[PDB]
Design a protein around this ligand. Structure first.
Ligand SMILES: OC[C@@]1(O)OC[C@@H](O)[C@@H](O)[C@@H]1O
Ligand SMILES: OC[C@@]1(O)OC[C@@H](O)[C@@H](O)[C@@H]1O
Ligand SMILES: OC[C@@]1(O)OC[C@@H](O)[C@@H](O)[C@@H]1O
Ligand SMILES: OC[C@@]1(O)OC[C@@H](O)[C@@H](O)[C@@H]1O
Ligand SMILES: OC[C@@]1(O)OC[C@@H](O)[C@@H](O)[C@@H]1O
Ligand SMILES: OC[C@@]1(O)OC[C@@H](O)[C@@H](O)[C@@H]1O
Ligand code: NA
Ligand code: NA
Ligand code: NA
Lengths: 88, 88, 88
């Protein structure tokens, strides 16, 4: 089936749910006023996520895997880019 | 194999582990005095979870997927019910 | 594909990413100064993780599944050992 990963922050809360579906990962977002589609859209058959909230900043790391290759995607307030994570 | 998702809260801690096994998701609970089977029992081949603790209340969201359909299940102090989450 | 699970703590942060790959789970670690391979290495086709930081101590629980058997692995400051978790 499709595979999901979820994270949340604050007291509203904000929630992000990532779904790997047919080789593509997309993102659904809740910030207290309805679900919507987020900016994250990257290839992958499997996804995990962690996040940490510091002051006014959310930091999100999404680990997207295809075959044996895992790419880390980073949100630090200014869009998604690949992070330095490698498998070894 | 079976697929799991885990969350925890507080300092005891309380832990919840969800297992998707043969199309069914069940829940195991730890609150500091042994593991036991929780109330959550719903269909699904894949599961993710997030939770947030506010004051005296734990809020849990479990994302259960079968095929391309994902159902959000909500714990907000009074049993599990379906939440408003949709895939798009 | 390979399957991952991730957790993080503090403000640096520390991040741990577990990868189930070809029946083996390994661990990659970030503590603010580069990624490295952690001590965790155990069998499994699926992995989930949760952690909680209390005072100066991180507690990590990794749920490793092969077939219908799930083993809980515990980090409480002194290496990884099997925990009391059972499926029922
Ligand atoms: O619009 C909300 C948003 O900016 O929140 C932070 C990230 O989850 C982004 O992908 C997302 O688009
Ligand atoms: O600021 C981005 C970054 O340094 O954040 C910490 C880790 O996620 C790294 O892999 C990543 O490159
Ligand atoms: O008995 C403990 C319990 O009420 O804790 C909150 C939820 O995890 C429930 O499914 C569970 O049954
Ligand atoms: O109180 C339930 C609810 O509003 O909580 C926030 C989100 O999980 C929603 O999808 C859900 O319907
Ligand atoms: O070296 C860092 C380390 O000790 O951090 C705690 C655990 O994640 C361990 O597996 C890991 O080796
Ligand atoms: O100290 C280890 C332990 O008691 O921690 C809480 C739970 O993870 C238990 O299954 C585990 O045996
Ligand atoms: Na992944
Ligand atoms: Na799911
Ligand atoms: Na598992």
């Amino acid at each position: 089936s499709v595979q999901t990963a979820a994270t949340s922050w604050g007291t509203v809360p904000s929630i992000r749910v990532y779904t790997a579906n047919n080789g593509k990962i997309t993102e659904r977002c809740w910030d207290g006023k309805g679900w919507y589609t987020g900016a994250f859209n990257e290839p992958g058959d499997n996804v995990s996520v962690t996040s940490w909230l510091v002051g006014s900043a959310i930091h999100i790391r999404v680990y997207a895997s295809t075959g044996t290759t895992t790419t880390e995607w980073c949100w630090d307030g200014n869009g998604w880019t690949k992070g330095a994570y490698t498998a070894t």
